[PDB]
Design an enzyme around this catalytic site. Structure first.
Site, mmCIF file in Angstrom:
data_model
loop_
_atom_site.group_PDB
_atom_site.id
_atom_site.type_symbol
_atom_site.label_atom_id
_atom_site.label_comp_id
_atom_site.label_asym_id
_atom_site.label_seq_id
_atom_site.Cartn_x
_atom_site.Cartn_y
_atom_site.Cartn_z
ATOM 1 N N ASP A 7 -51.400 -12.877 127.927
ATOM 2 C CA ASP A 7 -50.832 -13.865 127.038
ATOM 3 C C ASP A 7 -51.892 -14.963 126.817
ATOM 4 O O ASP A 7 -52.350 -15.563 127.778
ATOM 5 C CB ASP A 7 -49.544 -14.345 127.717
ATOM 6 N N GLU A 106 -49.867 -11.670 122.464
ATOM 7 C CA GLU A 106 -49.619 -11.020 123.746
ATOM 8 C C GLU A 106 -49.458 -9.507 123.694
ATOM 9 O O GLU A 106 -49.072 -8.941 122.672
ATOM 10 C CB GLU A 106 -48.392 -11.653 124.425
HETATM 11 N N1 LIG Z 1 -42.736 -22.760 117.099
HETATM 12 C C1 LIG Z 1 -43.914 -21.954 117.164
HETATM 13 C C2 LIG Z 1 -44.322 -21.450 118.389
HETATM 14 C C3 LIG Z 1 -45.496 -20.682 118.439
HETATM 15 N N2 LIG Z 1 -46.186 -20.448 117.301
HETATM 16 C C4 LIG Z 1 -47.441 -19.663 117.351
HETATM 17 C C5 LIG Z 1 -48.552 -20.562 117.751
HETATM 18 C C6 LIG Z 1 -48.759 -20.271 119.196
HETATM 19 O O1 LIG Z 1 -50.035 -20.635 119.673
HETATM 20 C C7 LIG Z 1 -48.549 -18.857 119.202
HETATM 21 C C8 LIG Z 1 -48.246 -18.354 120.553
HETATM 22 O O2 LIG Z 1 -47.032 -18.774 121.106
HETATM 23 P P1 LIG Z 1 -46.823 -19.258 122.578
HETATM 24 O O3 LIG Z 1 -45.378 -19.249 122.961
HETATM 25 O O4 LIG Z 1 -47.262 -18.213 123.478
HETATM 26 O O5 LIG Z 1 -47.428 -20.668 122.902
HETATM 27 P P2 LIG Z 1 -48.949 -21.005 123.033
HETATM 28 O O6 LIG Z 1 -49.862 -19.875 122.874
HETATM 29 O O7 LIG Z 1 -49.395 -21.882 121.909
HETATM 30 O O8 LIG Z 1 -49.170 -21.785 124.395
HETATM 31 P P3 LIG Z 1 -49.010 -21.208 125.848
HETATM 32 O O9 LIG Z 1 -48.689 -19.718 126.020
HETATM 33 O O10 LIG Z 1 -50.289 -21.431 126.614
HETATM 34 O O11 LIG Z 1 -47.919 -21.934 126.545
HETATM 35 O O12 LIG Z 1 -47.381 -18.696 118.346
HETATM 36 C C9 LIG Z 1 -45.764 -20.981 116.150
HETATM 37 O O13 LIG Z 1 -46.482 -20.742 115.031
HETATM 38 N N3 LIG Z 1 -44.646 -21.718 116.056
HETATM 39 CA CA LIG Z 2 -46.798 -15.702 124.166
HETATM 40 CA CA LIG Z 3 -49.654 -17.847 124.486
#
Ligand SMILES: Nc1ccn([C@H]2C[C@H](O)[C@@H](COP(=O)(O)OP(=O)(O)OP(=O)(O)O)O2)c(=O)n1
Ligand SMILES: [Ca+2]
Ligand SMILES: [Ca+2]
Ligand SMILES: [Ca+2]
Ligand SMILES: [Ca+2]
Length: 342
Positions: A7, A106
DNA sequence: GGCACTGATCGGGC
DNA sequence: TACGCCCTGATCAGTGCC
């Protein structure tokens, strides 16, 4: 089986950091600007520095700028992120018997054969995998290793960021007995609270509630899911997911109920959706409307045949008229979704 | 009853 | 308080049918 789940950390912001290293170590927010005003839009993701200030994915940009006004705010550039992702999924693929790309962010790798069933060589393969992604793309990821997909993901989430979480076969039973309901993937905040109200705080508490009463509260699928998980009878295979729907939805310059005002946006959305469909031919069209109060209203139709772009145009107006007919609110965003591909 | 399918909601980043 | 784009999505009530 031996599963490695990967991830990517704070993905969109992290890629922006790779492309602009001066952003690293300072609050950075990736914004989806809607175009209605200069600041109107939402947060796609924020690096961990900005999260410390309270910045959350989904939050209005104007609200983020209130609690973190010195953060760097940059527009989302999704094609670059897709390109990074693709390159990364290609790296993982050659480390696995089977790979399931779950999203842009992921993947699950079945590495059972690859490490000869030896769980500890799985951990080392996971370390080798992290190092390679870091050396080749300058992206940090968090990994989970476990005997199944769900545990691989849970322990990964507990290990963020830049983590390597592990759950060996010997510890599975133990681990399942302290797991909190709200930590299980698929169970949202609402349901978790309804379960909490009923005295169900741990996964193990699922085993003592009458199954038929559980089904009423969770629905059948979630009840079967929770019960399987609680009994360590979850074992779903690594498997390629198939695209089921493709769409496009945009924010209009102003709220509206005027058909002629709304139509140009609806049509652009169809044009762009057809570009994305490419060779896929859909039998179903749904027109989607986000109302002024951010409620979502939809009308759809399945055809006995494939829909050409010109039929999409005519049918989308009928569906839009249906929405305006049956809902009294003003419309903020308008879009279309296509599914049931031949 | 229950299969096959349908249209609609709205969650939550798969 | 405000407010995007996406569905490699889940859920479920309504329906026609035999
Ligand atoms: N409301 C959202 C949530 C996520 N995403 C997109 C951007 C994120 O970077 C990507 C990945 O989702 P993640 O849940 O895995 O969150 P992150 O990667 O950003 O952070 P992390 O896994 O480190 O907590 O999906 C989005 O466009 N809108
Ligand atoms: Ca994720
Ligand atoms: Ca992520
Ligand atoms: Ca509604
Ligand atoms: Ca979901």
């Amino acid at each position: 089986m031996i599963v490695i789940f990967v991830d990517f950390d704070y993905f969109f912001a992290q890629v922006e950091e790779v492309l602009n290293p001066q952003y690293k170590g300072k609050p950075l927010v990736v914004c989806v600007y809607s175009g209605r005003t200069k600041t109107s839009g939402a947060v796609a993701t924020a690096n961990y520095e900005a999260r410390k200030l309270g910045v959350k994915a989904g939050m209005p940009i104007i609200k983020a700028m209130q609690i973190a006004p010195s953060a760097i705010y940059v527009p989302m550039r999704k094609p670059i992120y897709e390109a990074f992702s693709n390159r990364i999924m290609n790296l993982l693929n050659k480390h696995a018997d089977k790979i399931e790309v779950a999203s842009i962010d992921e993947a699950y790798l079945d590495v059972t054969n690859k490490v000869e069933g030896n769980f500890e060589n799985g951990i080392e393969l996971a370390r080798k995998i992290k190092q390679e992604i870091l050396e080749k793309e300058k992206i940090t990821v968090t990994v989970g290793v476990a005997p199944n997909k769900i545990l691989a993901k849970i322990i990964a989430d507990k290990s963020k960021p830049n983590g390597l979480g592990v759950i060996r076969p010997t510890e599975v039973q133990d681990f399942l007995n302290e797991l909190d309901i709200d930590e299980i993937p698929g169970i949202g905040s609402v349901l978790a609270r309804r379960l909490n109200e009923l005295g169900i705080q741990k996964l193990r508490d699922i085993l003592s509630k009458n199954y038929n009463e559980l089904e009423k509260i969770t629905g059948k699928a979630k009840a079967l899911y929770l019960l399987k998980l609680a009994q360590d009878e979850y074992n779903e295979p690594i498997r390629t997911r198939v695209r089921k729907s493709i769409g496009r939805i945009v924010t209009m310059k102003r709220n509206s109920r005027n058909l002629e005002e709304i139509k140009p946006y609806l049509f652009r959305a169809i044009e762009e959706s057809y570009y994305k469909l490419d060779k896929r031919i859909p039998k179903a069209i749904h027109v989607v409307a986000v109302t002024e109060d951010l409620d979502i209203v939809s009308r759809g139709r399945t055809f006995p045949h494939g829909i050409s772009k010109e039929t999409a145009y005519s049918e989308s107006v009928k569906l839009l008229q249906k929405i305006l007919e049956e809902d009294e609110r003003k419309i903020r965003r308008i879009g279309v979704r296509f599914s049931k591909f031949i």
